[PDB]
């Protein structure tokens, strides 16, 4: 029972969160790359919205490129990436790791033609996955390569590298999940029953905390002063979790859980 749900299992099906943590890890430091998280061809307004934002940003040079994990509405991921080609041409690169061509996707094509009739679409139509689980790993790999202007893995390369790219990507995911759950639990001890605190109440809650040693506090506060506590900003469970997941202090707590 529930292989599809266990990260370690070879049958683990990637979620939008898995793909997003992986793309932000390999790409997120370059601001000129738009990373899409959630868009499915069964959401007609959201798909049109998404393509309009990205095509507008790329044609105007507000972004250089975009990577789009596109859900088929059918328990399946494909890779779409968009950049300027030669001569202010827009080039939409596509691969379904099943090797199924884009042509089926009349909704998708027509929505592109409506927004940008001059857009090129390069359907690589290359089979990659050798089972019904591995679309997530190949879509992550494909988008990274497409963003770098590198060719995607061939059928042969993909047959050979499938296990290694999942294993590599699942190593990063295991570590990332532990950093996030340690940061979340720390964020909870400091929010107590506030769903808002300022950076100023944070500083004071760390000082009064009854659990952390004086050295644990000194490390956490040094870690956060480096990039935060400048303008006394309002934090929530989510923004405080992300700020704490930034911390060497939290990354160390996670490091001991995993070894």
């Amino acid at each position: 029972m529930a292989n599809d749900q266990d990260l370690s299992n070879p049958e683990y099906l990637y979620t939008e969160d898995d793909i997003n943590q992986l793309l932000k890890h390999y790409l997120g430091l370059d601001d000129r790359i738009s990373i899409i998280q959630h868009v499915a061809l069964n959401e007609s307004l959201l798909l049109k919205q998404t393509l309009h934002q990205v095509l507008s940003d790329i044609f105007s040079g507000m972004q250089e490129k975009a990577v789009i994990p596109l859900h088929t509405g059918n328990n399946h991921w494909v890779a779409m990436a968009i950049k300027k080609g030669m001569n202010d041409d827009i080039v939409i690169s596509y691969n379904d790791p099943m090797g199924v061509s884009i042509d089926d996707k009349v909704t998708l094509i027509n929505c592109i033609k409506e927004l940008c009739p001059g857009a090129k679409i390069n359907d690589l139509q290359t089979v990659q996955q050798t089972n019904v689980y591995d679309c997530g790993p190949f879509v992550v790999d494909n988008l990274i390569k497409m963003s770098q202007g590198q060719p995607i893995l061939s059928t042969e390369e993909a047959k050979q590298q499938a296990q290694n790219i999942r294993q590599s990507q699942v190593n990063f995911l295991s570590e990332n999940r532990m950093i996030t759950s340690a940061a979340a639990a720390l964020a909870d001890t400091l929010l107590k029953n506030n769903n808002r605190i300022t950076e100023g109440v944070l500083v004071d809650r760390i000082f009064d905390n009854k659990i952390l040693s004086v050295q644990e506090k000194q490390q956490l506060l040094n870690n956060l002063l480096d990039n935060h506590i400048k303008e006394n900003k309002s934090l929530t469970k989510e923004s405080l979790t992300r700020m704490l997941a930034s911390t060497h202090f939290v990354q160390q707590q996670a490091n001991v859980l995993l070894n």
Binding site: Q49, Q53, R196, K233, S234, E238
Partner: protein, 77 residues
């Protein structure tokens, strides 16, 4: 004064009164106010991105009569 729309998990579209300078956490609190959905259960999407607490609507170029989506997490093989 600006209106935006939110499509909810039940398929209902609601209208929100907002400012461009409203924080995402403020928008999620307005959704909780009107529909009773807690912020931490909200997967709030504009044009394919999950909106992050500590950003504003204008950070995401969300303007008058924009539609946000409350979403279920996608997966596949």
């Amino acid at each position: 004064g600006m209106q935006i729309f939110v499509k909810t998990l039940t398929g209902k579209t609601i209208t929100l009164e907002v400012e461009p300078s409203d924080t995402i956490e403020n928008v999620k609190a307005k959704i909780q106010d009107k529909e009773g959905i807690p912020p931490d259960q909200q997967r709030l999407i504009f044009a394919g991105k999950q909106l992050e607490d500590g950003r504003t609507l204008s950070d995401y170029n969300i303007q008058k009569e924009s539609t946000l989506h409350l979403v279920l997490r996608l997966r596949g093989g």
